[PDB]
Short mmCIF file of C-alpha atoms in Angstrom, two decimals:
data_model
loop_
_atom_site.label_atom_id
_atom_site.label_comp_id
_atom_site.label_asym_id
_atom_site.label_seq_id
_atom_site.Cartn_x
_atom_site.Cartn_y
_atom_site.Cartn_z
CA UNK A 1 -53.22 54.11 -30.70
CA UNK A 2 -52.21 57.10 -28.49
CA UNK A 3 -48.56 58.14 -27.86
CA UNK A 4 -47.23 61.04 -25.85
CA UNK A 5 -43.67 62.30 -25.39
CA UNK A 6 -42.25 64.77 -22.88
CA UNK A 7 -38.68 65.57 -21.84
CA UNK A 8 -37.71 66.74 -18.36
CA UNK A 9 -34.55 68.79 -17.98
CA UNK A 10 -32.41 69.01 -14.86
CA UNK A 11 -29.34 70.98 -13.90
CA UNK A 12 -28.83 70.00 -10.30
CA UNK A 13 -27.21 72.32 -7.90
CA UNK A 14 -24.92 69.38 -6.76
CA UNK A 15 -22.96 66.66 -8.55
CA UNK A 16 -25.11 64.03 -6.80
CA UNK A 17 -28.76 64.56 -5.95
CA UNK A 18 -32.15 62.86 -5.53
CA UNK A 19 -35.01 64.71 -7.31
CA UNK A 20 -38.68 63.83 -6.98
CA UNK A 21 -40.34 63.67 -10.42
CA UNK A 22 -43.47 61.66 -9.67
CA UNK A 23 -45.76 64.67 -10.09
CA UNK A 24 -43.96 65.52 -13.31
CA UNK A 25 -44.70 62.07 -14.68
CA UNK A 26 -48.27 62.21 -13.39
CA UNK A 27 -48.69 65.51 -15.21
CA UNK A 28 -47.52 63.84 -18.38
CA UNK A 29 -49.90 60.90 -17.89
CA UNK A 30 -52.80 63.33 -17.61
CA UNK A 31 -51.73 65.35 -20.73
CA UNK A 32 -51.51 62.08 -22.71
CA UNK A 33 -55.20 61.36 -22.10
CA UNK A 34 -54.19 57.65 -22.04
CA UNK A 35 -56.64 55.44 -20.09
CA UNK A 36 -54.73 52.17 -20.18
CA UNK A 37 -51.08 51.86 -21.18
CA UNK A 38 -47.39 51.89 -20.42
CA UNK A 39 -45.23 54.78 -19.26
CA UNK A 40 -41.45 54.67 -19.74
CA UNK A 41 -39.34 57.12 -17.70
CA UNK A 42 -35.68 56.96 -18.59
CA UNK A 43 -32.51 58.97 -18.19
CA UNK A 44 -30.97 59.99 -21.47
CA UNK A 45 -27.52 60.03 -19.86
CA UNK A 46 -25.00 57.39 -18.63
CA UNK A 47 -24.28 59.34 -15.40
CA UNK A 48 -27.81 59.56 -14.02
CA UNK A 49 -30.82 57.23 -13.64
CA UNK A 50 -34.62 57.16 -13.11
CA UNK A 51 -35.21 54.90 -10.12
CA UNK A 52 -38.16 54.04 -7.92
CA UNK A 53 -37.48 54.34 -4.21
CA UNK A 54 -39.58 55.50 -1.37
CA UNK A 55 -39.51 58.84 0.50
CA UNK A 56 -37.83 57.87 3.81
CA UNK A 57 -34.79 60.10 4.66
CA UNK A 58 -32.71 57.43 6.26
CA UNK A 59 -33.14 55.19 3.24
CA UNK A 60 -32.02 57.98 0.97
CA UNK A 61 -28.87 58.25 3.01
CA UNK A 62 -28.38 54.47 2.98
CA UNK A 63 -28.55 54.35 -0.85
CA UNK A 64 -25.88 57.00 -1.28
CA UNK A 65 -23.62 55.20 1.20
CA UNK A 66 -24.31 51.76 -0.55
CA UNK A 67 -23.74 53.29 -4.00
CA UNK A 68 -20.43 54.83 -2.88
CA UNK A 69 -19.54 51.49 -1.29
CA UNK A 70 -20.38 49.42 -4.44
CA UNK A 71 -19.35 52.04 -7.04
CA UNK A 72 -16.92 54.35 -5.26
CA UNK A 73 -15.42 57.48 -6.66
CA UNK A 74 -11.94 56.59 -7.68
CA UNK A 75 -9.10 58.63 -9.15
CA UNK A 76 -7.60 55.69 -11.08
CA UNK A 77 -10.56 54.50 -13.25
CA UNK A 78 -9.38 53.94 -16.81
CA UNK A 79 -12.12 56.31 -17.99
CA UNK A 80 -9.91 59.03 -16.47
CA UNK A 81 -7.64 58.73 -19.47
CA UNK A 82 -10.00 61.27 -20.93
CA UNK A 83 -9.44 63.61 -17.95
CA UNK A 84 -13.03 62.82 -16.87
CA UNK A 85 -13.22 61.35 -13.44
CA UNK A 86 -16.90 60.61 -13.21
CA UNK A 87 -16.30 56.92 -13.79
CA UNK A 88 -18.14 56.10 -10.56
CA UNK A 89 -21.23 57.87 -11.92
CA UNK A 90 -21.32 55.52 -14.89
CA UNK A 91 -21.04 52.52 -12.61
CA UNK A 92 -23.83 53.90 -10.40
CA UNK A 93 -25.98 54.17 -13.59
CA UNK A 94 -25.27 50.56 -14.38
CA UNK A 95 -26.05 49.55 -10.75
CA UNK A 96 -29.36 51.38 -10.39
CA UNK A 97 -30.45 50.92 -14.01
CA UNK A 98 -31.19 53.99 -16.18
CA UNK A 99 -35.01 53.53 -16.33
CA UNK A 100 -38.45 52.27 -15.10
CA UNK A 101 -41.64 51.35 -16.87
CA UNK A 102 -44.94 52.05 -15.17
CA UNK A 103 -48.54 50.97 -15.83
CA UNK A 104 -51.33 53.39 -16.55
CA UNK A 105 -54.62 52.12 -15.15
CA UNK A 106 -57.95 53.99 -15.40
CA UNK A 107 -56.11 57.16 -16.48
CA UNK A 108 -53.70 56.93 -13.57
CA UNK A 109 -50.06 56.13 -12.85
CA UNK A 110 -50.37 52.64 -11.30
CA UNK A 111 -48.10 53.00 -8.24
CA UNK A 112 -47.61 50.98 -5.04
CA UNK A 113 -48.41 52.51 -1.57
CA UNK A 114 -44.89 53.81 -1.06
CA UNK A 115 -43.38 53.97 -4.59
CA UNK A 116 -41.97 57.36 -5.66
CA UNK A 117 -40.12 58.08 -8.91
CA UNK A 118 -36.80 59.90 -8.60
CA UNK A 119 -34.22 61.32 -10.95
CA UNK A 120 -31.02 60.21 -9.39
CA UNK A 121 -28.24 62.56 -10.50
CA UNK A 122 -24.69 61.12 -10.16
CA UNK A 123 -22.77 63.87 -12.06
CA UNK A 124 -24.96 66.87 -12.27
CA UNK A 125 -24.55 70.65 -12.38
CA UNK A 126 -25.28 70.64 -16.10
CA UNK A 127 -28.32 70.30 -18.38
CA UNK A 128 -29.44 66.66 -18.63
CA UNK A 129 -32.76 65.21 -19.71
CA UNK A 130 -35.18 62.46 -18.78
CA UNK A 131 -37.64 61.11 -21.41
CA UNK A 132 -41.23 60.20 -20.68
CA UNK A 133 -42.75 58.04 -23.34
CA UNK A 134 -46.37 56.95 -23.07
CA UNK A 135 -48.34 54.57 -25.38
CA UNK A 136 -51.75 52.98 -24.98
CA UNK A 137 -55.45 53.96 -25.22
CA UNK B 1 -55.52 48.73 -29.04
CA UNK B 2 -55.88 45.96 -26.38
CA UNK B 3 -54.82 46.39 -22.71
CA UNK B 4 -55.11 43.95 -19.85
CA UNK B 5 -54.35 44.38 -16.15
CA UNK B 6 -54.01 41.77 -13.40
CA UNK B 7 -52.56 41.95 -9.89
CA UNK B 8 -50.90 39.03 -8.14
CA UNK B 9 -50.89 38.98 -4.35
CA UNK B 10 -48.33 37.24 -2.17
CA UNK B 11 -47.95 36.75 1.55
CA UNK B 12 -44.88 34.56 1.78
CA UNK B 13 -44.42 32.20 4.60
CA UNK B 14 -40.81 33.58 5.04
CA UNK B 15 -39.24 37.04 5.06
CA UNK B 16 -37.17 36.06 1.99
CA UNK B 17 -38.43 33.72 -0.71
CA UNK B 18 -38.29 32.88 -4.43
CA UNK B 19 -41.76 32.30 -5.98
CA UNK B 20 -42.35 31.03 -9.50
CA UNK B 21 -44.96 33.18 -11.28
CA UNK B 22 -44.30 32.32 -14.92
CA UNK B 23 -47.53 30.34 -15.26
CA UNK B 24 -49.39 33.18 -13.58
CA UNK B 25 -48.10 35.61 -16.18
CA UNK B 26 -48.79 33.14 -18.98
CA UNK B 27 -52.35 32.85 -17.71
CA UNK B 28 -52.65 36.61 -17.92
CA UNK B 29 -51.23 36.69 -21.45
CA UNK B 30 -53.86 34.19 -22.54
CA UNK B 31 -56.75 36.12 -20.84
CA UNK B 32 -55.58 39.32 -22.60
CA UNK B 33 -56.12 37.75 -26.02
CA UNK B 34 -53.11 39.84 -27.17
CA UNK B 35 -51.34 38.39 -30.24
CA UNK B 36 -48.37 40.75 -30.40
CA UNK B 37 -47.37 43.10 -27.60
CA UNK B 38 -45.50 43.93 -24.43
CA UNK B 39 -46.00 42.48 -20.96
CA UNK B 40 -44.76 44.38 -17.89
CA UNK B 41 -44.42 42.43 -14.62
CA UNK B 42 -43.44 44.62 -11.73
CA UNK B 43 -43.38 44.59 -7.95
CA UNK B 44 -45.49 47.30 -6.40
CA UNK B 45 -43.22 47.35 -3.35
CA UNK B 46 -39.67 48.60 -2.55
CA UNK B 47 -38.79 45.41 -0.61
CA UNK B 48 -39.47 42.83 -3.32
CA UNK B 49 -38.77 42.47 -7.06
CA UNK B 50 -39.86 40.60 -10.24
CA UNK B 51 -36.69 39.08 -11.69
CA UNK B 52 -35.89 36.60 -14.43
CA UNK B 53 -33.60 33.79 -13.37
CA UNK B 54 -33.49 30.18 -14.24
CA UNK B 55 -34.66 27.15 -12.22
CA UNK B 56 -31.34 25.65 -11.04
CA UNK B 57 -31.21 25.10 -7.21
CA UNK B 58 -27.57 25.90 -6.77
CA UNK B 59 -28.01 29.18 -8.60
CA UNK B 60 -30.91 30.09 -6.36
CA UNK B 61 -28.65 29.58 -3.40
CA UNK B 62 -25.84 31.58 -5.02
CA UNK B 63 -28.14 34.60 -5.58
CA UNK B 64 -29.22 34.72 -1.95
CA UNK B 65 -25.60 34.49 -0.81
CA UNK B 66 -24.53 37.23 -3.39
CA UNK B 67 -27.46 39.46 -2.39
CA UNK B 68 -26.59 39.14 1.31
CA UNK B 69 -22.96 39.80 0.40
CA UNK B 70 -23.74 42.94 -1.71
CA UNK B 71 -26.74 44.16 0.33
CA UNK B 72 -26.35 42.61 3.78
CA UNK B 73 -28.80 42.81 6.60
CA UNK B 74 -27.46 45.40 8.94
CA UNK B 75 -28.68 46.69 12.28
CA UNK B 76 -27.23 50.19 11.79
CA UNK B 77 -28.85 51.32 8.47
CA UNK B 78 -30.16 54.86 8.84
CA UNK B 79 -33.58 53.60 7.71
CA UNK B 80 -33.71 51.98 11.16
CA UNK B 81 -34.44 55.37 12.64
CA UNK B 82 -38.00 54.40 11.90
CA UNK B 83 -37.62 51.17 13.90
CA UNK B 84 -37.79 49.29 10.56
CA UNK B 85 -34.77 47.20 9.91
CA UNK B 86 -35.52 45.94 6.45
CA UNK B 87 -33.07 48.37 4.92
CA UNK B 88 -31.24 45.50 3.22
CA UNK B 89 -34.49 44.53 1.47
CA UNK B 90 -34.68 47.96 -0.14
CA UNK B 91 -31.10 47.68 -1.32
CA UNK B 92 -31.80 44.20 -2.72
CA UNK B 93 -34.75 45.76 -4.66
CA UNK B 94 -32.43 48.36 -6.08
CA UNK B 95 -29.83 45.67 -6.95
CA UNK B 96 -32.15 43.23 -8.71
CA UNK B 97 -34.45 45.89 -10.19
CA UNK B 98 -38.19 45.87 -9.34
CA UNK B 99 -39.42 44.72 -12.81
CA UNK B 100 -39.12 43.01 -16.26
CA UNK B 101 -40.77 43.60 -19.59
CA UNK B 102 -41.50 40.64 -21.82
CA UNK B 103 -42.53 40.28 -25.48
CA UNK B 104 -45.72 38.62 -26.58
CA UNK B 105 -45.25 36.84 -29.89
CA UNK B 106 -47.99 34.86 -31.70
CA UNK B 107 -50.15 34.93 -28.54
CA UNK B 108 -47.30 33.67 -26.39
CA UNK B 109 -44.91 34.90 -23.70
CA UNK B 110 -41.65 35.20 -25.71
CA UNK B 111 -39.18 33.48 -23.34
CA UNK B 112 -35.65 32.10 -23.74
CA UNK B 113 -34.92 28.33 -23.27
CA UNK B 114 -34.16 28.67 -19.57
CA UNK B 115 -35.83 31.98 -18.54
CA UNK B 116 -38.30 31.77 -15.62
CA UNK B 117 -40.07 34.71 -13.98
CA UNK B 118 -39.87 34.90 -10.19
CA UNK B 119 -41.29 37.08 -7.47
CA UNK B 120 -38.35 37.62 -5.25
CA UNK B 121 -39.59 38.46 -1.75
CA UNK B 122 -37.01 40.26 0.48
CA UNK B 123 -39.35 41.21 3.39
CA UNK B 124 -42.40 39.10 3.16
CA UNK B 125 -44.95 37.56 5.53
CA UNK B 126 -47.48 40.23 4.58
CA UNK B 127 -49.78 41.00 1.64
CA UNK B 128 -47.83 42.49 -1.28
CA UNK B 129 -48.75 42.74 -4.93
CA UNK B 130 -47.20 42.37 -8.36
CA UNK B 131 -48.79 44.13 -11.39
CA UNK B 132 -49.09 42.59 -14.82
CA UNK B 133 -49.78 45.13 -17.50
CA UNK B 134 -50.25 44.02 -21.09
CA UNK B 135 -50.74 46.21 -24.23
CA UNK B 136 -50.70 45.32 -27.90
CA UNK B 137 -52.95 43.60 -30.50
CA UNK C 1 -51.65 49.08 -33.71
CA UNK C 2 -48.24 48.14 -35.26
CA UNK C 3 -45.92 45.45 -33.82
CA UNK C 4 -42.59 44.23 -35.13
CA UNK C 5 -40.36 41.40 -33.93
CA UNK C 6 -36.74 40.59 -34.80
CA UNK C 7 -34.19 38.28 -33.18
CA UNK C 8 -30.46 38.93 -33.20
CA UNK C 9 -28.12 35.96 -32.88
CA UNK C 10 -24.60 36.05 -31.48
CA UNK C 11 -21.86 33.49 -31.10
CA UNK C 12 -19.02 35.54 -29.69
CA UNK C 13 -15.49 34.60 -30.32
CA UNK C 14 -14.80 35.01 -26.51
CA UNK C 15 -16.60 33.96 -23.33
CA UNK C 16 -16.98 37.66 -22.40
CA UNK C 17 -17.46 40.41 -24.95
CA UNK C 18 -19.08 43.80 -25.62
CA UNK C 19 -20.95 43.96 -28.98
CA UNK C 20 -22.42 47.11 -30.47
CA UNK C 21 -26.00 46.49 -31.66
CA UNK C 22 -27.35 50.03 -31.89
CA UNK C 23 -27.41 49.98 -35.70
CA UNK C 24 -29.09 46.58 -35.57
CA UNK C 25 -31.86 47.99 -33.42
CA UNK C 26 -32.10 51.11 -35.57
CA UNK C 27 -32.50 48.86 -38.60
CA UNK C 28 -35.36 47.13 -36.85
CA UNK C 29 -37.00 50.44 -35.92
CA UNK C 30 -36.93 51.46 -39.58
CA UNK C 31 -38.36 48.08 -40.80
CA UNK C 32 -41.21 48.41 -38.26
CA UNK C 33 -42.39 51.65 -39.87
CA UNK C 34 -43.39 52.74 -36.32
CA UNK C 35 -43.56 56.54 -35.88
CA UNK C 36 -44.17 56.70 -32.15
CA UNK C 37 -43.72 53.77 -29.79
CA UNK C 38 -41.66 51.59 -27.50
CA UNK C 39 -38.74 49.34 -28.38
CA UNK C 40 -37.73 46.50 -26.05
CA UNK C 41 -34.26 44.97 -26.52
CA UNK C 42 -33.66 42.02 -24.26
CA UNK C 43 -31.33 39.07 -23.89
CA UNK C 44 -33.09 35.75 -24.06
CA UNK C 45 -30.41 34.19 -21.86
CA UNK C 46 -29.43 34.35 -18.14
CA UNK C 47 -25.69 34.66 -18.95
CA UNK C 48 -25.80 37.76 -21.15
CA UNK C 49 -27.55 41.16 -21.09
CA UNK C 50 -28.59 44.14 -23.29
CA UNK C 51 -27.19 47.23 -21.59
CA UNK C 52 -26.81 50.88 -22.50
CA UNK C 53 -23.33 52.26 -22.00
CA UNK C 54 -21.30 54.70 -23.93
CA UNK C 55 -18.41 54.08 -26.36
CA UNK C 56 -15.37 55.15 -24.28
CA UNK C 57 -12.62 52.43 -24.13
CA UNK C 58 -11.52 53.11 -20.61
CA UNK C 59 -15.09 52.84 -19.38
CA UNK C 60 -15.47 49.51 -21.11
CA UNK C 61 -12.45 48.29 -19.23
CA UNK C 62 -13.75 49.72 -15.94
CA UNK C 63 -17.08 47.84 -16.29
CA UNK C 64 -15.38 44.49 -16.81
CA UNK C 65 -13.14 45.11 -13.80
CA UNK C 66 -16.20 46.27 -11.66
CA UNK C 67 -18.28 43.28 -12.83
CA UNK C 68 -15.48 40.85 -11.94
CA UNK C 69 -15.10 42.66 -8.62
CA UNK C 70 -18.86 42.54 -7.77
CA UNK C 71 -19.63 39.19 -9.45
CA UNK C 72 -16.31 37.35 -9.65
CA UNK C 73 -15.69 34.07 -11.34
CA UNK C 74 -15.56 31.51 -8.62
CA UNK C 75 -14.90 27.78 -8.64
CA UNK C 76 -17.09 27.08 -5.59
CA UNK C 77 -20.50 28.54 -6.63
CA UNK C 78 -23.25 26.07 -5.79
CA UNK C 79 -24.37 26.23 -9.42
CA UNK C 80 -21.19 24.22 -10.10
CA UNK C 81 -22.95 21.16 -8.76
CA UNK C 82 -24.09 20.82 -12.33
CA UNK C 83 -20.47 20.92 -13.58
CA UNK C 84 -21.25 24.38 -15.03
CA UNK C 85 -19.02 27.05 -13.68
CA UNK C 86 -20.53 30.09 -15.29
CA UNK C 87 -22.21 31.11 -12.07
CA UNK C 88 -20.54 34.52 -12.24
CA UNK C 89 -22.18 35.10 -15.64
CA UNK C 90 -25.61 34.68 -14.09
CA UNK C 91 -24.76 37.13 -11.35
CA UNK C 92 -23.44 39.61 -13.93
CA UNK C 93 -26.84 39.27 -15.73
CA UNK C 94 -28.62 40.06 -12.52
CA UNK C 95 -26.28 43.03 -11.87
CA UNK C 96 -26.53 44.67 -15.28
CA UNK C 97 -30.17 43.70 -15.91
CA UNK C 98 -31.07 41.58 -18.98
CA UNK C 99 -32.84 44.38 -20.94
CA UNK C 100 -33.62 48.04 -21.91
CA UNK C 101 -36.69 49.75 -23.28
CA UNK C 102 -36.25 52.64 -25.68
CA UNK C 103 -38.61 55.30 -27.07
CA UNK C 104 -39.35 55.72 -30.73
CA UNK C 105 -39.93 59.36 -31.59
CA UNK C 106 -40.69 60.67 -35.11
CA UNK C 107 -39.66 57.29 -36.60
CA UNK C 108 -36.38 57.29 -34.70
CA UNK C 109 -34.70 55.52 -31.80
CA UNK C 110 -34.87 58.23 -29.08
CA UNK C 111 -31.29 58.13 -27.73
CA UNK C 112 -29.22 60.47 -25.55
CA UNK C 113 -26.02 62.16 -26.93
CA UNK C 114 -23.73 59.37 -25.78
CA UNK C 115 -26.05 56.34 -25.31
CA UNK C 116 -25.09 53.18 -27.23
CA UNK C 117 -26.82 49.80 -26.97
CA UNK C 118 -24.58 46.79 -26.37
CA UNK C 119 -25.00 43.05 -26.15
CA UNK C 120 -22.90 42.19 -23.19
CA UNK C 121 -21.85 38.54 -23.47
CA UNK C 122 -20.76 36.93 -20.14
CA UNK C 123 -20.56 33.26 -21.32
CA UNK C 124 -20.40 33.26 -25.04
CA UNK C 125 -18.87 31.13 -27.79
CA UNK C 126 -22.27 29.63 -28.56
CA UNK C 127 -25.48 30.69 -30.33
CA UNK C 128 -27.53 33.06 -28.16
CA UNK C 129 -30.27 35.47 -29.12
CA UNK C 130 -31.49 38.96 -28.32
CA UNK C 131 -35.17 39.90 -28.98
CA UNK C 132 -36.29 43.23 -30.37
CA UNK C 133 -39.94 43.88 -29.82
CA UNK C 134 -41.52 47.06 -31.12
CA UNK C 135 -45.14 48.32 -30.64
CA UNK C 136 -46.73 51.66 -31.41
CA UNK C 137 -47.97 53.65 -34.45
#
């Protein structure tokens, strides 16, 4: 059986940011030479997630507003006992889920007509990685 | 290694609907002849998800009410700049997560005593697909 | 191809509880002899989930408070028609997502610097299982 691993590193210019990584993942799928298989794309951190959204602008704005609404920055989270006040970023990671698993069909990332893979940074400005793990034939 | 792919197509009679697809997935697991492996079941759209719930009626009603409560239809989402006002469906997809991964054990879908796989449509009435991707031996 | 299955059983002392199972999963990864692969860790129940959080105390308290806030116990959920009033536990399962999929790299669980796998019980005090399903080489 074939297996392929690749790590993507980000250091966003902002604390919160949406980064397209579909082509990155597609590059990995090609390198893996896998014809049929599974492709896991997961954030290795608790304050960021790999999500599948689409490209529309307005929707990107809606998700930040919904995230802030459901998992708002707060000064009083208990996590702040450590002096860290990125508690909301952890909640946003829980909310959105840290990862996605995609099919590989006929040597291709099996995506829907509008699906796009993003690295959703919730506490960036420092080096953080995303793992791509592919298995199959 | 063995790999099997199958797409399920839905065109719900309603914008929002709960559709049982466990037997569909089980049919695919049988066709794949896989003894031991993994089975990914994922929506190929941003406005629908594959979820695992159970069969109880009341709970089905609770999830729609909770979804509407956490990701309410709204006329003012920015996504509406496109004239599309299914923004809430995208949020519901984020909320519930687009997919599930299930074990295949001894040639069988490895499910809990009450687990049932559903295709949860949040903006239906048009052709949308779900991918089943199986790998293993 | 190699495949390995192991079930973890819990019967929490409390209705709601956070249980570390990272070492349990690591034990399974070792037993599987898999060098490169995927490792699914999923709750077999609708009222509990496998989540990835980190170890900080304050954050553990924040997640219970956020969960209760987003998916509060309630006496009036429709699910209660059955006399069961664990409706909130089902919602919490939806919220947090029942499972996680982890990479196996060089015979090791491929985890981030702070990632820890937990069994998050939302209606415990009875025997419930978590499945570990590993495939790869």
